[PDB]
Amino acid sequence: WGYDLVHSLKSPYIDSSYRERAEVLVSEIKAMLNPAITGDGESMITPSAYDTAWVARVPAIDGSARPQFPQTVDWILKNQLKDGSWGIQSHFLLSDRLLATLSCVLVLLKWNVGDLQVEQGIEFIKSNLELVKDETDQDSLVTDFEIIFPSLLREAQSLRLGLPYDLPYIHLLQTKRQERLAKLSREEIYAVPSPLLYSLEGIQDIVEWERIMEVQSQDGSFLSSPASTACVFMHTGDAKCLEFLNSVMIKFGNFVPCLYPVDLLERLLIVDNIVRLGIYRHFEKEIKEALDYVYRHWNERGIGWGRLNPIADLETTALGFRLLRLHRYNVSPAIFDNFKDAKFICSTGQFNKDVASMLNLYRASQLAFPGENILDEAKSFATKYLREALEKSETSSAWNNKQNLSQEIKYALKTSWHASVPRVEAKRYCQVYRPDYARIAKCVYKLPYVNNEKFLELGKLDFNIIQSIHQEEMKNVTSWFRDSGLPLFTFARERPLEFYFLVAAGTYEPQYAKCRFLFTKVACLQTVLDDMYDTYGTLDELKLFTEAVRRWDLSFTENLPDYMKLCYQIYYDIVHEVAWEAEKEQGRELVSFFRKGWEDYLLGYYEEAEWLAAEYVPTLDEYIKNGITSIGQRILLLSGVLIMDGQLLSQEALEKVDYPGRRVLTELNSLISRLADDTKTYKALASSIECYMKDHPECTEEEALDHIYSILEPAVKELTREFLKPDDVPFACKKMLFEETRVTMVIFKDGDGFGVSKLEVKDHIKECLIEPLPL
Ligand SMILES: [Cl-]
Ligand SMILES: [Mg+2]
Ligand SMILES: [Mg+2]
Ligand SMILES: [Mg+2]
């Protein structure tokens, strides 16, 4: 550890060829995504054999005895899998194969063709149905399986196909079907668009076709389902229905997907994945183009996965809310009123979709601004839902286990967005992201623009390049620390890597090396100043040191004890090196501004020193006032933020994020740091807890702690708004301040009062800065 560990590191990814390879990946990715955000190749989605077979049913509109779309028949005949089923070969899901195979077998029979495919299709259905012993064996269910399959299977039964119609599992499905159909308002199907419009082909005996057009989508589809739309068409001859089938055939050629379009959801999944992989900074233009389009279609009623959906979708709406707000678009969490009742519902659709909706709601809820009570409710509700989902047997289906759903859920619940290490989360996601990820709706499908090899390849490479660059910086850091004189103060612990990590883990970009470096010097100085003021020094010594702080005269230190003479000199050098760099970057005078900041900080320390010497316990108001200034986060933050390559902060601009006395970014960080620190430790002079109990003699320790959190929680919402707020402050500066707060919040998370876990601090440095991703 320390100097020796760091200088032994030898990362290959520093060589310029790796960055050059990464730039080819970036260009290839932009080319791949171009049709999805700029062109017309939108909605890239795999075939649905099940839906294709429904479209193949439509008889020629000229009245002749052939299909209107004979290419779909040809497709089906040519795409049977080796086991006799239809579906995507890479991923086997019983309900998907059962539904799709029975659908294809029936359409082939209609047109009197593919006798061999039909024979093999029937064998698969019969064979696999007889393997189901109990419920646990059915696996994950595609959308509305319980409703559609009994209906489709009755159709087969009327044709007397050789299927096991009398199996227990079959009877169970009918039972489940009746159960779903009971809670159904029939009269409302025609008045209020609902999830069931996605599967009309499964409830033909219920639907009055002459009334169903009122809930048709503007593009002629029924909830974007080709199968469902085709069904309505054969019953009504509706022209807009036909136009929708035509548009889908024109787009895909000889097949259809199970959802079309998916323009809104797809765009958001692309951005989500790019962001979580840590590679967003390469694709600013594409992310703006994607989100601008989503925002154009953002409305008070929420959004569906496609822009023409007649009803909003919680999964897509919650994802959109989060990404839009995260990217500084103005959205209101009142859109979640659309998914309420007399509160929330979303306990109806297919399981994976329901879980995805609640994960997205849970995540969106963490981006709350002050006074946004509905997000507080959303959080509670989503948390409760997700905790229950873990206890559900569906969560442990073979399919869900293969995708580690329970792990994803558990990880989501233990993960607080505010208390996160950004570089570490991206690293972890590169380890979970799947190029061949399969999703569920009416059938199993993939979105190749969202899930592919290139994303991951760039993700891993980019992470390793960034990390190797940081490893070289850590050599400079440790090299500087060693010759700095700081190691001489043996009453203070040496933590240069921990302070480096504090900034590098959030502000990682290669151009901000000077920012990380100066930040690390100041934090190293501060830990020594801190131990000097609250532990090592005597009041009389500290009065002398505090006086020299006021004078800014090196010659004046002749009065000080030897150890303080040295401390003053290092302090004086570091302050003025930071100042010089800042003036270089900013092009204006900043020495006076920095000196004032250091004065306030250390006078704060001295006031605290006087309190200790007098065994004085301040009121909580006094404690907080002093603690915001003396915790020293402010002057530390300024020492990094004013020296970010190419980021100009006028005085006016700076005062929007730094202004002692106001609730701006640096002030909120100071307050949050002080209190998150107290809540984390305090048990191990006097803290905020102890101060409240002096102010309120009768209150318990529990009441005292609870009150501290009542100050914390609102502060964190304000931090979030100040960060994301639109303004004329360089966003990179705001992000630096925010990300430093986030890493701080990781360090002090879960405040039981015992103290900080030093062992986990090290593990974070290891994961983030030491060990690369395997390629
Ligand atoms: Cl998968
Ligand atoms: Mg202290
Ligand atoms: Mg201390
Ligand atoms: Mg402490």
UniProtKB/Swiss-Prot annotation:
Gene3D superfamilies: 1.50.10.160, Farnesyl Diphosphate Synthase, Terpene synthase, N-terminal domain
Entry's induction text: By wounding.
CC terms in the record's Gene Ontology section: cytoplasm
Pathway the protein takes part in: Terpene metabolism; oleoresin biosynthesis
GO molecular function: alpha-bisabolene synthase activity; magnesium ion binding; terpene synthase activity
Positions contributing to Mg(2+) 1 binding: 530, 534
Cofactor or coenzyme needed: Mg(2+); Mn(2+); K(+)
Amino acids binding Mg(2+) 3: 677, 681
Tagged with keyword Metal-binding: yes
Key words of the record: Cytoplasm, Lyase, Magnesium, Manganese, Metal-binding
Alphabetical list of CDD domains matching this protein: Terpene_cyclase_plant_C1
GO biological processes: diterpenoid biosynthetic process
Superkingdom to which the source organism belongs: Eukaryota
E.C. numbers: 4.2.3.38
Function: Converts farnesyl diphosphate to alpha-bisabolene. Involved in defensive oleoresin formation in conifers in response to insect attack or other injury. Involved in sesquiterpene (C15) olefins biosynthesis.
Name the UniProt record assigns to this protein: Alpha-bisabolene synthase
Organism, as annotated: Abies grandis (Grand fir)
Gene name as annotated: ag1
